[model samples]
Target: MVPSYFGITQNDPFIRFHTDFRGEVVNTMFENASTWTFSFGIWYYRLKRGLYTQPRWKRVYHLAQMDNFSISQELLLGVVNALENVTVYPTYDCVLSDLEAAACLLAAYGHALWEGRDPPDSVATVLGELPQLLPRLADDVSREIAAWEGPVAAGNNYYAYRDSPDLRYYMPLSGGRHYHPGTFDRHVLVRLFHKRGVIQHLPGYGTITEELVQERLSGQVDVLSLWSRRLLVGKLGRDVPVFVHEQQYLRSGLTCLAGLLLLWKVTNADSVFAPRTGKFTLADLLGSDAVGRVRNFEFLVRYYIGPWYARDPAVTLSQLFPGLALLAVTESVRSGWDPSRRSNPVADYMFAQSSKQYGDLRRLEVHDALLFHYEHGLGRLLSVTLPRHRVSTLGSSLFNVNDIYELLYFLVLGFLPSVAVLP
Candidate 1:
């Protein structure tokens, strides 16, 4: 629920910004919402179909496991799951802005090296066409948005142009809506920035710097194939089984091709390896396998096609500080997963099973460490510079007096969920 203080300060600018920015955030949610709804529909159908064929013992086992939580608690847990999964945050804007600008700069430089033409209109073309590139994702995304019956009109959507008659000015291409770069792609671009130049080093990984660029990528006519091969080698290592290598090889190819497609889309380069029709969506790229291939598409969304929609940051402290708090909690969780917490046979079994997924735990730890540096390094500098500049942006920027009080009210309401969960 929205804080009650928001009701009292309806006219306050900071308060108004928070309320108005809801459209932007929700529009981000809507990007993932289309793919999510599509995936969930198939998931529900499969689960229901499978459940009907399951044996009585299996059904009883499911019942036994579900007995751990009451129906009321299960319903409440659904809300938490949604909160955890759905993307909503302003901090990413700063990182995404840096990402898009860097990609544009590199892409333009590459064009000048290869195309030998002035980049007057192509860069703007990239900026314009990028947000609506994924017609497959956008097809459903537009359908979802167009069918909205919520109180907030499409006119209030963030990517919606305020002064224009077209509500989806920033959202569509021709007649289709493209995917927004939400939380998933937000950090992938940050990591990709590490791979490129915007970030210098990665956690648990080596430096990618000047000597390497000149020795490898500088003035190269084609760097994408090399990128894919390097990604395959770097990600999977040399000792993996042939099956594993092949699987990763496919991912690497698709990932690199996806990036190349963006450059192609922007530059209109003839050799970029496109379809005969000159117009194709992600669905066309993935072909018949696109339906249940949610994870692969999610990977591309985060890593490849994600940074195409980045915009500039107004004030980035809003992104970093809140991130610090989350990392602290996640790191604490990662470090605390041990036998010391065990008190029963069930605990032993849980620990033993969780041990099988240690890779996931380590992956998250590495991710958290990288994000910590991303947040802290930038956040630390911003902290020192805070005295030199003014703080703007609502909700995420805690500098405002009203914003702080509103946050307190939010926390108070948040506390009740925990309070109710307790015996």
Candidate 2:
């Protein structure tokens, strides 16, 4: 007899495998029966370092700038919700506590907007409403925001870097050669805000011209590191060179992934088979040339670079192998079973070898392998390192939550069915 839960008829084996696999992993990682306290502790440390503290005032400043947009609250909240529900150990630094509170408050604000509900009287209203919903987090939104604000405001480039308290960061329309003042990341924030109706032609917020937006969407610019280049020219010009650096992993990963996700979400395209021109959708972005580059970079790092030579050996065949296979499978599925033209052939072959070697481990093993690499390997390493720590003080803990949430969101939102094709 057919199972009642198996509503869809096509791709039964893949669907069932994915569903059962995901369920077991989620249950083991999050359910009360699991013993992931040490993992959770490491996650908390990473989260505390990445999102909670003001280690990198510049990054926080950028975040604050993004906050000026409408979707910022929701995105931030989604981040916070992920952090809260994912189990982790607590610390006394109050940094993680504050960061978590701030993210939760922001998320609550986003939820209100999502539901068409009114903004709360106080930030705490939103956070307080979800009492104990998150483990080891503070309930005060205002305090968290207040603490973050000082660092954000102080780091403002126009004011802080210039030493001109009254004169804010501004580049004239004439286009002189100084850093463009804002990064490509800044443009992303602006676009999000404009789409959400948060900031529309507001004075002092800068205008979102079609040209500027396209430049960002097309990977024609790099906002963060462009400052130094602009300074060299001694005149702020229209030429915001979007240098594609193969070595800068973090920035490249963050910008590329965020851009692809945003573009896919906006455009609703299944793949980037062509050049995305003029007000492209999220689908167009992911299907564009950028995705290939990003994938290549991810492969080099995972299989060839630091992990390959690290003294402690961060890379694991169990972890790296399955992910490459899944990506291949996903690409194949998306492209109607075509094998060629997929990213990273060698990595794909390695993944195939590993899968055959460990066939006895089952689908659950595959899921766990991917999860550990994403959550504990790349995510954790990135969080504990510099720059990312500046964004979220707690480090990998926050990122682990992100990993889980990414999977959970995909599962709950029903995208998993398309990729995994379970019974």
Candidate 3:
């Protein structure tokens, strides 16, 4: 998420080098939205480890085990699965933004490099298109945020990049959890910044030392990944996996989709998502495969495409793409618009699920819903703007009143489920 950090080197032809695929600092070519890379990036950047200095991959592998999303190459294959018919053009749908494109490009490339696996040639071809788009995206980002005067002038969001006197300087920081520097990277939930001169942390008092960051990250990864997967089901009625609690890999897949599933379960009608039935309709199995494949795309959306779209272009991190990509993808899932209807799993689920859900009620889409689970489908869920506060102790300039999470949550709520609230 850190933009080009020209400040690290001397000004006057500033060199804003950021971490590349191998965690070595290179000329920072692109901004990272899917910031799972921050974990390894933090190690090399803060530790001042040179390009020759290898990261402790064994520890990273341990962390990867806890996070199924970061390490799973199958997830990347699923993205390629969706991209089979896709072609080289301006990016499409969820993967449209430059940052998102950049993330996917790197991810796919690294998957090839480190994992010794190649994505579908089409996927590789599109991933290569990202770098050319960077200059255009940067210009667009600058113009968009500049126009959104209310939030920026109030000293918040994009304002963090500016040298504001109001921001507090908590000196000699040991460590802390936050959302910046890694702001563009959605995969990055909690990034700890430090002395690498990378602009990904909170405005003041960046990362702690590498060893401390590792200590902080390791203990937290297991615990944080476990945070609040239990979302309210079907108007907060029932939750799942109780019916044949199995398939740890697919069970692994389910919790990851918890947020979006909650959105779907809530926005949908009680009839559509009529709770889990006693009948085993193979509905879960079919959808499970698609969900695994869909995640690669969603990661692209959350980090890369979504951040850059439906936003004020001038601001580097402004608007973060107004959830348009999110709306597009989730709408299809909730409404049964099969994104890849010809493809298995993708080709297999949805309408059948809809029929399974509604036949019990609407008696419609009968051909689609042979299975009971298909008939009773999940509900849909939905999107915002920024905040203000009083002066900090310094009192010279106004303190940034904006709350990042609050604004973003409300933005999602306002979109589809107008009266939405966190459960």
Candidate 4:
């Protein structure tokens, strides 16, 4: 029910949801003795991104820890090769990808550790050099550890920013009144997240069709299995292009801050650094990147900033409205992917509550407003009902299965027990 799943956000997919005709639910990372090679990139970043949230299982007298050797060095080093300039002159926006690339590095490393495996040598060195780079990101012109204020929010969730001149808040999609134009600051927040994700440009220099649309414009889902025998479930909807300016949307960038928070909580003794006098500070957490902190902050900074708006945005709304309403209503009321907040305007129009004795389309727009590969989180988790093979931990080694043996382990030689290391 929570925005968590597969143990990344600290919720068990099998344990949270239930069935009427089915037996109780349960779920693994692996069983093997092999070296896991790191995939150094994100041409698949959108699809493979979720793999970073996993934490090794805890049981018996032992708790498996994420590998100590994080490949942050490889990630930072690979940034030199992470360029894909679709523009004549590159801008700070590439930093969006670069920084997110950094995040993916941490996430993937964390995920890798979850499987009881070590990182590749190339990745290993990069992680070692991270502290050097991290502290530098926050270097101050005044020669002191500069302190900038972020949005008044405490936790940095989907709220963040992008590249180039700060775009006017809620641009073009105006809600009539003037908005306080700026980025975020850390003034202690309730639901407002502060742990930064990628705080660079959204569609800066290299912000192309691919990254803008495919990478930033989309979100990922679990290998979610939906039921064929129940409810208003239907086939995966036909793929349609969502046309909206990449920059004009809410926000962009990626970071596993909360995910890492969960990681640190589970492995506090395994933390990489020591704390200062009164708990953690920005300088203590992100290092040099802290200087890169705030002049302004991005909000509702979601993965999708642009969509291909071919026709009237309103018309697009009409078509998507119904399905989205149904989507919000159907999902368990604990996920960000659904209309889970206590007071949803769209709640009254979905499924059984549809007829209000009047035509109400605007409310539906709110629900339709929410992507995986890009769909909502719930759709990715609960939409499907795939036959899970799970896995078994073998010997002192952790082995995940190969693509072929994903359904049949010992059948293939390269059938690394990798696939099963999940919730």
TM-scores for candidates 1 onward, in order: 0.22, 0.19, 0.17, 0.22
Candidate 4 lDDT tens digits, 1-423: 332111111110111223210011101111111112222122112112222343211121122223321123222112111111100112232222222223333433333223443432322233333333223322211121134343321112222222113321222232322123233221111012122222122212223445435544565310001110110022114321111122221122122222112111222221122222222121211232321321000100111011111111111211212222122222323243332221222222222122344343443232233211112222222122221111111101222212211211111111112111223
The per-residue C-alpha lDDT of model 3 at residue 77 equals 23
Winner of 1 and 4 under lDDT: 1
Could you tell me which residue pairs clash in candidate 1?
Answer: 91-319, 138-177
lDDT of all predictions: 0.26, 0.26, 0.23, 0.21
| Ten-residue region with minimum lDDT total, candidate 3 | 391-400
Q: How far is each candidate from the true structure, as Cα RMSD in Å?
A: 23.4, 24.6, 29.0, 23.1
List residue ranges in candidate 2 displaced over 4 A. 1-117, 121-181, 184-186, 191-423
lDDT by residue for model 1 (1-423), tens: 452111211122221122323233223333332222121112122222433355642343232222122112222222222222111122221122222232343343334334353332332344343333333322423444355443431213211111122221111122122222221121222233333443232222344557546756666322333322332343246632221112222222222222332222222212122223212122221222332211222222332233222222221211212222222122223333211221121112222223455564443333333322222222222222231121112112221112222222122111011100222
**Candidate 2 lDDT score relative to the true structure:** 0.26
